[PDB]
Amino acid sequence: DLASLAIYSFWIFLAGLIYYLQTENMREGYPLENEDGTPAANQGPFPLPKPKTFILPHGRGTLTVPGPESEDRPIALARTAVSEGFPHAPTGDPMKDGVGPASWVARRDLPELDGHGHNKIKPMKAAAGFHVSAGKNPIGLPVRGCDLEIAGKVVDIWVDIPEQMARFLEVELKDGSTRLLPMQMVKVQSNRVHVNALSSDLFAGIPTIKSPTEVTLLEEDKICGYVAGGLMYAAPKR
Amino acid sequence: ALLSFERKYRVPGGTLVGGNLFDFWVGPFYVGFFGVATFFFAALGIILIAWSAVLQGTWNPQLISVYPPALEYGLGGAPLAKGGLWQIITICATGAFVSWALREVEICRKLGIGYHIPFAFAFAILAYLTLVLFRPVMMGAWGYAFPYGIWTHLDWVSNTGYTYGNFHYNPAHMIAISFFFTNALALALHGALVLSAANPEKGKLMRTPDHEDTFFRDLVGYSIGTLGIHRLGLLLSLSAVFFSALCMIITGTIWFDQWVDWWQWWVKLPWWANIPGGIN
Amino acid sequence: AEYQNIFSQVQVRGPADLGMTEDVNLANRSGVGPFSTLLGWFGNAQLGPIYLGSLGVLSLFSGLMWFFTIGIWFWYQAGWNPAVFLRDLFFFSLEPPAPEYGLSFAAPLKEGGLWLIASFFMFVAVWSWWGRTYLRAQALGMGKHTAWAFLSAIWLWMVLGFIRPILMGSWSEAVPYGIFSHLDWTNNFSLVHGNLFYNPFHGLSIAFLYGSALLFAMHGATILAVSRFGGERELEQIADRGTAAERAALFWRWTMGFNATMEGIHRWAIWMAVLVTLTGGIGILLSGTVVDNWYVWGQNH
Numbered sequence: 079d080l081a082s083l084a085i086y087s088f089w090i091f092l093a094g095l096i097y098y099l100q101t102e103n104m105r106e107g108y109p110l111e112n113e114d115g116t117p118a119a120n121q122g123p124f125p126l127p128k129p130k131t132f133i134l135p136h137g138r139g140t141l142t143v144p145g146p147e148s149e150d151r152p153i154a155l156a157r158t159a160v161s162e163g164f165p166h167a168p169t170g171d172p173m174k175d176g177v178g179p180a181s182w183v184a185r186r187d188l189p190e191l192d193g194h195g196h197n198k199i200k201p202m203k204a205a206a207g208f209h210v211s212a213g214k215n216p217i218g219l220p221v222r223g224c225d226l227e228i229a230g231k232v233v234d235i236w237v238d239i240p241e242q243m244a245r246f247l248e249v250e251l252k253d254g255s256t257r258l259l260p261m262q263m264v265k266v267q268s269n270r271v272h273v274n275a276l277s278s279d280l281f282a283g284i285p286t287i288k289s290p291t292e293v294t295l296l297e298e299d300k301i302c303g304y305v306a307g308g309l310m311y312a313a314p315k316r
Numbered sequence: 317a318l319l320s321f322e323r324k325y326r327v328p329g330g331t332l333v334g335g336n337l338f339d340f341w342v343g344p345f346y347v348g349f350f351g352v353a354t355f356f357f358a359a360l361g362i363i364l365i366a367w368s369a370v371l372q373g374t375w376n377p378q379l380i381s382v383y384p385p386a387l388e389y390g391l392g393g394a395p396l397a398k399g400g401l402w403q404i405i406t407i408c409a410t411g412a413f414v415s416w417a418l419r420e421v422e423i424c425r426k427l428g429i430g431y432h433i434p435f436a437f438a439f440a441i442l443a444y445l446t447l448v449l450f451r452p453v454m455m456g457a458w459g460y461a462f463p464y465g466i467w468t469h470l471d472w473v474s475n476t477g478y479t480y481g482n483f484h485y486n487p488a489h490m491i492a493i494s495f496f497f498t499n500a501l502a503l504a505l506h507g508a509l510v511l512s513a514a515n516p517e518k519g520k521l522m523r524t525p526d527h528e529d530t531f532f533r534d535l536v537g538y539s540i541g542t543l544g545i546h547r548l549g550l551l552l553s554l555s556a557v558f559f560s561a562l563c564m565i566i567t568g569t570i571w572f573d574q575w576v577d578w579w580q581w582w583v584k585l586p587w588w589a590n591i592p593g594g595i596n
Numbered sequence: 597a598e599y600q601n602i603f604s605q606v607q608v609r610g611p612a613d614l615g616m617t618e619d620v621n622l623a624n625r626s627g628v629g630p631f632s633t634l635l636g637w638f639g640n641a642q643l644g645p646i647y648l649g650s651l652g653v654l655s656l657f658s659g660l661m662w663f664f665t666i667g668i669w670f671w672y673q674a675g676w677n678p679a680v681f682l683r684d685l686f687f688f689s690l691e692p693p694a695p696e697y698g699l700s701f702a703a704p705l706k707e708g709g710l711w712l713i714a715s716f717f718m719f720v721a722v723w724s725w726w727g728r729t730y731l732r733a734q735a736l737g738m739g740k741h742t743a744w745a746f747l748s749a750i751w752l753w754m755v756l757g758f759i760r761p762i763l764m765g766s767w768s769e770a771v772p773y774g775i776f777s778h779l780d781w782t783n784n785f786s787l788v789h790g791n792l793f794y795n796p797f798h799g800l801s802i803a804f805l806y807g808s809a810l811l812f813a814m815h816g817a818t819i820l821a822v823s824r825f826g827g828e829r830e831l832e833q834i835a836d837r838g839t840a841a842e843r844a845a846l847f848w849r850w851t852m853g854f855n856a857t858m859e860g861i862h863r864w865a866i867w868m869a870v871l872v873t874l875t876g877g878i879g880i881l882l883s884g885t886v887v888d889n890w891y892v893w894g895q896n897h
C-alpha cells in the first residue's frame with residue numbers, strides 16, 4: 079500500500095544520500111597510502127568524487143579537490159617496528175622538526191583577507207577604533223611558563239577585525255624580540271598571563287613572523303602547532 | 317591504510333595507562349589500553365545478549381529483549397534468566413561506554429587537542445546511567461529501569477510516560493524538548509550557512525565569513541559568530557540531554573502523581589485562586 | 597586548569613560593522629543597534645543592523661496580527677480580568693471550527709472563524725518570511741541552502757495544519773493555538789492512530805532528532821578542541837586545509853574508523869537535521885488519510 083511504497087522508496091533514497099555524503103568527504107586525504115607513501119591496495123567501496131573547483135576571492139586563484147596530495151615538507155620520523163600500525167619516532171627535536179602534536183601544515187604563506195581584501199588579523203596598535211571593552215586587559219602583563227618562570231611580557235593584542243575577537247598576544251622576550259601566542263592557549267589572570275603548554279626556555283623557540291604587522295596562514299600554523307606540541311614535549315619541565 | 321597527511325601525526329606517547337604496550341593502530345582504529353578494554357566489555361556483553369537469546373527461544377532481532385529483575389528482587393541480584401543477565405550486561409555496557417570515553421582522551425593527548433569531545437560524550441553516558449542506574453537505585457528496584465529490546469524498550473518509554481498521565485506536563489521534559497528542537501533548528505542553519513558561503517551561486521566567488529555574519533544581521537539582526545555558533549551548538553546539545561536526565565530523576569522520586577496536577581501550584585496562588593471566570 | 601574557550605577572556609570592540617554590500621539595497625538597512633557586553637562573552641556583541649524591506653514588513657505585520665488575534669481571544673475567555681489571564685494563560689485556547697463546518701470559512705467567529713482569521717495571518721507571515729530568507733541570500737550572492745532547509749520545516753508545519761486537514765475534509769483536524777491545548781492535541785493524535793511509536797517515519801524522525809543532537813555535540817566539541825589552531829575559521833580551512841582540519845579529521849578516523857572534511861561535515865549537518873521534519877512530515881501526512889492505525893498496519897505492512 080502507499081505507506082509501504084513510501085518507506086521503501088525512502089530507505090533507497092537514504093542509501094544514495096549516505097553514498098553522496100561519504101564521497102564528498104573524500105575530497106581530502108585520498109587516495110590512502112601505505113606507511114611508505116605509495117598508494118594503498120585497498121581504497122574501500124567508495125570511489126573518489128569528480129573534481130570541483132573553488133574560485134577564491136581577491137584574485138587568489140583557484141582550488142581543485144580532490145587533487146595532487148603532497149606534504150611539501152620533510153618529515154623527521156622513522157619506523158619503530160617491522161610491520162604496519164606502529165608509532166613512528168621523531169629523529170630530531172619533534173618541536174623544532176614539526177611532528178606529532180607539534181605538526182603544522184604548509185598552508186599558503188599569505189595572510190587571510192576579510193570581505194574587502196584587508197588583512198584579517200592586525201595588531202591592535204594599527205587597528206583603528208579597537209580597544210579592550212570588557213574583562214582584564216592583558217597588555218602590560220608578564221607572561222609565565224609552565225615552569226613558573228617569567229618568559230616575557232604582553233606588548234599588544236592581535237585582533238580579528240571582521241569578527242572583533244582576540245586571536246593572539248604579542249609577547250616581548252628577554253632579548254627584545256616578539257612572538258605570538260594563540261589566545262586559546264593562555265590563561266589571562268589578574269596579575270599575569272599563564273601559558274601551561276610551554277616552559278620559559280621554550281618561548282624563544284616559537285616560530286617568528288617575517289612582517290611585524292601581519293601573520294600568514296603558514297606562520298599561524300607553525301606557531302599554533304609549536305605551542306601545542308609543548309603540551310606533550312615540554313612536560314619534562316612543566 | 318593512511319590518509320595522505322597522516323604519518324606525521326602517528327607519533328609515540330599520549331597513553332594514560334600501559335606506556336607503549338598498546339600504543340599502536342589496527343587499520344584506521346587507534347588501540348590503546350582502553351581500545352582493548354572496550355573490546356572485552358563489548359564482546360562479553362554481546363555473548364551474554366546472544367545467550368539470553370536462547371533462553372527466550374528466538375533469534376529475531378525485533379523480538380530479542382533482555383528484561384531486568386522484577387520489582388520483587390529489590391536492588392539485589394537475580395537469576396540469569398529472570399534479570400540476572402540484564403544486570404551483568406548493564407555492567408558490561410557501562411564498562412564499554414566509559415572505556416570508549418577514556419579512549420578518546422588518549423587520542424586527544426596524541427593529537428594535542430582539547431578534551432571537548434570525550435567531555436561531551438560523558439553527557440550521554442550520564443543520561444543512560446540515570447535510566448539504568450540512578451533512578452532505579454533511588455526508587456528501590458532494578459525493575460524501574462528499561463529493557464534492552466528494539467521495541468520492548470519503546471514500550472517501556474510509553475508505559476513509563478503514561479504512568480504519570482500525559483508526560484508532556486513534566487516541566488523538565490518541556491525544557492528538554494525545547495533544547496532539542498532548538499538544537500536541530502540551529503544545526504540546520506549553521507550547516508546551510510557555511511555551505512551557502514563555500515558554494516555561492518554558479519560562477520561567483522567563494523563568499524567570506526563576512527558575508528555570513530552579514531547575511532544573518534540582515535535576516536534577524538544578529539550574528540553569533542563562527543566561534544559562537546559552535547559554542548552554541550555544543551551547548552544546546554549537552555543541555556537538552558542534561559534537562560532530559562533531570563526530567564527523569566525527579567519522576568518517580570520527588571514526584572509520583574499525575575504530572576498535569578503539578579501545575580496547580582500556579583493556578584492555586586492566593587491572589588487569583590478564587591477570582592471567577594477563565595478556565596479554572 | 598587550561599583554557600576551554602567556552603566564554604571569551606577579553607572582549608575587544610571596534611567600529612560598528614555595516615556589513616558587506618554586494619547588490620543589497622542599502623536604503624533598507626537600519627542603523628547599528630547597541631553593543632551587548634553580555635552577548636560578547638559568548639558571541640558577537642553587535643546587535644543590528646537589520647534589513648527591513650517590503651517583504652520584511654509584510655511578514656513582521658502578519659506575524660503580530662496572528663499573535664494579537666490569538667490574544668484577543670485569550671483575554672476574552674479571561675473575562676478581561678488581568679489576574680485570570682495571567683493565572684490560566686496556559687489553559688486558554690483558540691480551537692479550530694467544529695467538524696460540521698467542514699472545509700468552509702463560513703463558521704462563526706466564536707467557534708473557529710477567529711482560528712481561520714489567525715491562521716491566514718500565520719500563513720502569510722511564514723511564507724513571506726521564507727521568501728525573505730531566499731532574497732537576502734541572492735542579494736549577497738550566496739547559495740540557497742538556508743532557504744531550502746527552511747522549506748523542510750515549512751513542510752511539517754504545512755502538513756499539520758493545512759495539507760492534512762484538507763485531505764481529511766475538515767479544519768477540525770488542525771492544531772489549536774494554545775500552550776497546553778496543543779500538547780493535548782498531540783497526545784490524542786497518537787492514541788487515535790494506534791500509538792505513533794508504530795509509525796516508521798515517526799520512528800525515523802526521532803532517529804535524526806537524536807542524531808542532530810549527537811552531531812552538533814560532536815561538531816561543536818570538535819571545532820572547539822582545535823580552535824587552538826584556528827578551527828572556527830572553517831571557510832579558509834576549506835580553501836586551505838590547516839593542521840586544524842587534519843587533527844580534527846584524524847581524531848575521528850582513529851576513533852571510529854572514518855572521518856569527514858571541513859566542508860563535508862556541514863553537508864552531514866545540513867541533512868541530518870533537515871530529515872527530521874522531512875520524514876516527520878510524511879509520517880503525519882499518511883496518518884488518518886491512508887493508515888488508520890499504525891499498530892494494525894504494523895502487523896501486515
Ligand code: BCL
Nearest residue numbers: 484489490491493494495497498753756771775776779782
Ligand atoms: C512536533 C509535535 C507538536 C508539538 C509538540 C510540543 C511538545 C511535546 C512540547 C512543545 C513545546 C513548545 N512548542 Mg510545540 N508542537 C508542535 C507545534 C508547534 C507550532 C507551529 C507548528 O507551527 C509551534 C510554534 C510550537 C511551539 C512550541 C513552543 C511554544 C514550546 C517550545 C519551546 C521551544 O524551544 O521552541 C523552539 C523554538 C525556538 C527556540 C525559537 C522561538 C522561541 C519560542 C517562541 C519561545 C516560547 C517560550 C514560552 C512561551 C515560554 C513560557 C514561559 C514563561 C515563564 C511563562 N509548537 C507540534 C504540533 N511542543 C514544549 C513546551 O514546553 O510546551 C509547553 C514541549 O514540551
Ligand code: BCL
Nearest residue numbers: 440441443444473474476477483484492493560561563564
Ligand atoms: C508516551 C510517552 C511520553 C514520553 C515519555 C518519555 C520518557 C519515559 C522518557 C522520555 C525521554 C525523552 N523524551 Mg519523551 N515522552 C513523550 C513525548 C515526547 C515528545 C513529543 C513531541 O510528544 C518529545 C520531543 C519528547 C522528547 C524526549 C527527549 C527530550 C528525551 C529523550 C532523549 C534523551 O534522554 O537522550 C539521552 C540519551 C541516552 C539515554 C542514550 C545514551 C547513549 C549511550 C551513552 C551510548 C550507546 C551506544 C550504543 C550502545 C553503541 C552502538 C555502537 C554500534 C557500533 C552502532 N518526548 C510522551 C508524552 N520521554 C527520556 C529522558 O528524559 O531520559 C533521560 C525518558 O526517559
Ligand code: BCL
Nearest residue numbers: 362444447462466467470473798799800802803804806807
Ligand atoms: C531516549 C529515551 C529512551 C529511548 C527512546 C527511543 C525512542 C522513542 C525511539 C528510539 C529509537 C532508537 N533507539 Mg532508543 N531510547 C533509549 C535508549 C537507548 C539506548 C541506550 C544504550 O540507553 C540505545 C542504544 C538506543 C537505541 C535506539 C536506536 C536503536 C533507535 C534510534 C535510531 C537513532 O537514530 O538513534 C540515535 C543515534 C544515532 C543516529 C547514532 C547512530 C547509532 C546507531 C543507530 C545505533 C544502533 C544500535 C543497535 C540497534 C543496537 C546494537 C547492540 C549490539 C549489542 C551491538 N536507545 C531511552 C531508554 N529510542 C527509535 C526507533 O526507531 O526505535 C524502534 C525511536 O523512535
Ligand code: BCL
Nearest residue numbers: 749750753782783785786792798801802805876877879880
Ligand atoms: C503522546 C504522543 C506521541 C507522539 C506524537 C507525535 C505527534 C502527533 C507528532 C510527533 C512528532 C515528532 N515527535 Mg513524537 N510522540 C511521542 C513521543 C516521542 C518521543 C519519546 C522519547 O517518547 C520522541 C523523541 C519524539 C519525537 C518527535 C519528533 C522527531 C517529531 C517532531 C520534530 C520537530 O522538530 O517538530 C517541530 C518542528 C515544527 C513544528 C516545524 C514547523 C515550525 C514553523 C515553520 C515555525 C513557526 C514559527 C512561528 C510563526 C514563530 C515563533 C517565533 C517567534 C519569535 C515568537 N516523540 C508520543 C508517543 N510526535 C511530529 C512529527 O513530525 O511526527 C512524524 C508530530 O506531528
Ligand SMILES: CC[C@H]1c2cc3[nH]c4c(c3C)C(=O)[C@H](C(=O)OC)c4c3nc(cc4[nH]c(cc(n2)[C@@H]1C)c(C(C)=O)c4C)[C@@H](C)[C@@H]3CCC(=O)OC/C=C(\C)CCC[C@H](C)CCC[C@H](C)CCCC(C)C
Nearest residue numbers: 358361362409412416436437440465466554806809810813
Ligand atoms: C550531548 C549528548 C549527545 C551525544 C553525544 C555523543 N555521543 C557520542 C559522542 C558524543 C559527544 C562520542 O564521542 C561517541 C562517538 O564515538 O561518536 C561517533 C558517541 C556515541 N554515541 C552513540 C550513541 C548514541 N548517542 C545518543 C545520544 C547523544 N550522544 C546525545 C544527543 C543516542 C540516543 C539518542 O539514544 C545513541 C544510541 C554511540 C554510537 C557512540 C559511542 C560508541 C561506543 O561507546 O562504542 C563502544 C561501545 C560498545 C561496543 C557498547 C556495547 C555494550 C553492550 C555489550 C551491548 C549493548 C547494550 C545496550 C544496553 C543495548 C541497547 C539496545 C537498544 C535497542 C535499547
Ligand SMILES: CC[C@H]1c2cc3[nH]c4c(c3C)C(=O)[C@H](C(=O)OC)c4c3nc(cc4[nH]c(cc(n2)[C@@H]1C)c(C(C)=O)c4C)[C@@H](C)[C@@H]3CCC(=O)OC/C=C(\C)CCC[C@H](C)CCC[C@H](C)CCCC(C)C
Nearest residue numbers: 497500501504659660663721722725745746749869870873
Ligand atoms: C529541520 C527543521 C528545523 C528548523 C529549521 C529552520 N527554522 C528556520 C529556518 C530553518 C532552516 C530559517 O531559515 C528560519 C530563520 O529565519 O531562522 C533564523 C526559521 C525559523 N524557525 C522558526 C521557528 C521554529 N522552528 C522550529 C523547528 C525547526 N526549524 C526544525 C527543528 C520550531 C519548533 C521546534 O516548533 C519553531 C517555533 C522561526 C522563528 C523562524 C522563521 C520566522 C517566521 O516564520 O516568521 C514570521 C514572523 C512572525 C511570526 C513575527 C511575529 C512573532 C511574535 C508572534 C511576536 C513577538 C516578537 C516580535 C519580534 C515583537 C515585535 C515588537 C515591536 C514593538 C517591535
Ligand SMILES: COC(C)(C)C/C=C/C(C)=C/C=C/C(C)=C/C=C/C(C)=C\C=C\C=C(C)\C=C\C=C(/C)CC/C=C(\C)CCC=C(C)C
Nearest residue numbers: 663666667715716719753754756757758771773774775778
Ligand atoms: C499581553 O497581551 C497582548 C494583547 C499583547 C497579546 C498577547 C498574546 C498571546 C498571550 C498570545 C498567545 C499565543 C500562543 C501561546 C499561540 C501558540 C500556538 C501553538 C503552540 C501552536 C501552533 C500550531 C499551529 C500550526 C500547526 C498551524 C499551521 C497553520 C497553517 C499551515 C495555515 C492554515 C491555513 C488556513 C486555515 C487557510 C488560510 C487561507 C489560504 C488558502 C491562503
Ligand SMILES: [Fe+3]
Nearest residue numbers: 510815819830
Ligand atoms: Fe562548523
